[PDB]
Amino acid sequence: AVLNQPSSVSGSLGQRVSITCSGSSSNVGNGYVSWYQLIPGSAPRTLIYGDTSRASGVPDRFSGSRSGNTATLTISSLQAEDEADYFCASAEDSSSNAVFGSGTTLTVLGQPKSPPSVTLFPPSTEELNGNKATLVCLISDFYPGSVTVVWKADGSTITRNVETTRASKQSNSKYAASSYLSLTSSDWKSKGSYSCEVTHEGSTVTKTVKPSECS
Amino acid sequence: QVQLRESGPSLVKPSQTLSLTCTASGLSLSDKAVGWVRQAPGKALEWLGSIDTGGSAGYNPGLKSRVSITKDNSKSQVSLSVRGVTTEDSATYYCTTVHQKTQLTKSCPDGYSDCYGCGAYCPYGCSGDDCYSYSSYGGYTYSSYSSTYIYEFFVDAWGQGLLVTVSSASTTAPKVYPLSSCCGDKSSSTVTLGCLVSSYMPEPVTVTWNSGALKSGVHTFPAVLQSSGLYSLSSMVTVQTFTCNVAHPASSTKVDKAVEPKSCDGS
């Protein structure tokens, strides 16, 4: 029912990687296998059909092959934008009964480190009219994709009512995230300054807003 | 060329019937069936079925009892129905064009080589048949092609997809608040503005700026989920008027919010 792929695979920038798709005589052994690329937040893209034929607009760096009940997708001269989930697919018994592979997440190693860009937004005058204040920390352009977020007011660390997203893939194959500090209107005005401190690969980037000077 | 677009409700109650529609158009539609593929949050791609030019529908055997696929050529639309849905049916649903064809394929029988690719070693009897074999026992034997069927399948084109959530919970439309930097912020020639899409459920929402006319310098962030069960996300612009267009399909709400930098005027 499933075509077995490795859950995850890694390769170096500028080198080659291979993803396998193993099945039985009914599917992969049938000799017509397709491959698809899925970049999160994007429509799937067909890469290969009929074992070795490349779909339109797919460069020769992508290559398909098959030996018995196991097909492999081979990507050469790996680039950052090749980071995606790759699925094999095949027909089984019928040409209108498709089986998909379990999927493989590809990581391209060896890309440069990138510090995060941080923007801290204060609560709006409209929101504070409802006695609530949402501080918004927007974090973009960091690789690798992992940051730790810390909120502070007047030097003290705040843990209450903090909610932070996981890092998500941007359009440029880098990562983005956000953190939200939820306060009452009185909490917002009662402190001299709030800070959003974003730590990435041991380095911290900080932005700060002052309520009394926010107008 | 192909254009595939999915439409239908983003939220469906358990045990009800999920109904979706795909509006297809383009010269590249011909020779192709229109199919439906879904992907649940942590799962792989799953095939649902398709309807071909001949007007017949084929289905995933595991879902045939619950799935129905029809077409309305007067509207150039193909429909999908899933009966008795559970939370297992929450997924992103893709409209596709599909290639499906059973092909008769000729190959040499076991142990025989092709008489066309023997170079200068071809036996003379190759003139009468397609394949040949040799054993030091009985010498050269000959044979015709064997015939097998090869079932071809591949998805050609994909739609953008539509997210459907199966749940019995109601919706909450978002509030849109403007985002602008503090007046006491250290300044630069770059202005950061944004829109806070706050406290909605369920997913998704979309954000554009100035009805799509403004795109460069626009960064929209995936949502956070609070303890209340409500989502919130923000979209920011870096650089006139600035209007963010927020759409929340599950509640049938569209919001236009004009955003200005802080005047820092006493006003």
Q: How many CA atoms lie within 13 A of B149 on its CB side?
A: 11
CATH of the domain at B232: 2.60.40.10
Angstrom distance (rounded) from CA A31 to CA A40: 29
Angstrom distance (rounded) from CA A5 to CA A70: 10
Note whether B104 and B33 are within 8 A (CB).
Answer: no
- Find the CB nearest A44 among B46, B49, B94: B94
Q: Where are the alpha helices (DSSP H) in chain A?
A: 125-128, 185-189
Q: Residue A156 corresponds to which amino acid?
A: S
β-bridge partners, A144: none
Closest CA relative to residue A181, chosen from A160, A210, A155: A160
Angstrom distance (rounded) from CA B27 to CA A25: 36
Note whether A179 and A197 are within 8 A (CB).
Answer: no
Among B1, B32, B45, B99, the strongest candidate for a mutation testing the A interface, having the largest count of A CBs within 10 A, is: B45
Angstrom distance (rounded) from CA B24 to CA B241: 36
Supply φ then ψ for residue B100, to 5 degrees: -140, 130
Query: In chain A, what is the greatest distance between 2 CA atoms, to the nearest angstrom?
Result: 72
Find the domain containing B202 and state its range.
175-258
- Method for structure elucidation: X-ray
Chain CA centroid to CA B29, Å: 16
Closest CA relative to residue B19, chosen from B74, B61, B72, B58: B72
Tell me if A49 and B61 make a contact (CB, 8 A cut-off).
no
- Domains of chain A (ranges, CATH numbers): 1-110 (2.60.40.10), 111-211 (2.60.40.10)
Angstrom distance (rounded) from CA B199 to CA B264: 28
DSSP tag of A101: B
Closest CA relative to residue B215, chosen from B189, B235, B187: B235
Q: Gaps after which residues in chain B, C–N over 2.5 Å?
A: 239
Note whether B197 and B234 are within 8 A (CB).
Answer: yes
Angstrom distance (rounded) from CA B34 to CA B56: 11
Tell me if A124 and B234 make a contact (CB, 8 A cut-off).
no
Task: Write out chain A residues lying below 8 Å of B156, CB-based.
Answer: 46, 55
Asked, as a colleague might, if the bond just before A144 is cis with ω within 30 of 0, I would say yes
Note whether B81 and B19 are within 8 A (CB).
Answer: yes
Supply φ then ψ for residue A3, to 5 degrees: -95, 125
Note whether B87 and B14 are within 8 A (CB).
Answer: yes
Residue identified by tokens 């890469």 is: A47
Chain CA centroid to CA A34, Å: 24
Q: Residue A70 corresponds to which amino acid?
A: T
Q: What is the CA radius of gyration of chain B?
A: 29
Q: What angle do CA A26, A32, A36 make, to 5 degrees?
A: 110
Angstrom distance (rounded) from CA A118 to CA B191: 14
Cβ neighbors of A125 (< 8 A, separation 6 or more) are none
Residue B61 sits at the chain A interface (C-beta within 8 Å): yes
As given in the structure block, the two tokens for residue B171 are 């919706």
β-bridge partners, A138: A119, A178
Supply φ then ψ for residue B200, to 5 degrees: -130, 160
Residue B94 sits at the chain A interface (C-beta within 8 Å): yes
Tell me if B52 and A122 make a contact (CB, 8 A cut-off).
no
β-bridge partners, A85: A38, A105
Cβ neighbors of A167 (< 8 A, separation 6 or more) are A142, A145, A146, A147, A175, A176, A177
Chain CA centroid to CA B9, Å: 16
- Find the CB nearest A91 among B152, B157, B160: B152
Task: Write out chain A residues lying below 8 Å of B59, CB-based.
Answer: 96-97
Angstrom distance (rounded) from CA A109 to CA A105: 13
Note whether A177 and A163 are within 8 A (CB).
Answer: no
Angstrom distance (rounded) from CA B239 to CA B261: 11
Query: In chain B, what is the greatest distance between 2 CA atoms, to the nearest angstrom?
Result: 106
DSSP tag of B29: G
Cβ neighbors of B147 (< 8 A, separation 6 or more) are B104, B105, B106
B151, burial (CB in 10 Å: exposed 0-12, middle 13-18, buried 19+):
buried
Residue of chain A whose Cα is closest to the Cα of B190: A119
Say whether A80 sits in a helix, a strand or coil.
helix
Shortest distance, CA B101 to any CA of chain A (angstroms): 6
Note whether B224 and A163 are within 8 A (CB).
Answer: yes
**Percentages helix, strand, coil for chain A, rounded to the nearest 5?**
10, 55, 40
Closest CA relative to residue A98, chosen from B233, B155, B21: B155
As given in the structure block, the two tokens for residue A142 are 């960091």
Angstrom distance (rounded) from CA A147 to CA A151: 13
Chain CA centroid to CA B159, Å: 5
Angstrom distance (rounded) from CA B267 to CA B254: 29
Residue identified by tokens 């190759």 is: B126
β-bridge partners, A183: A133
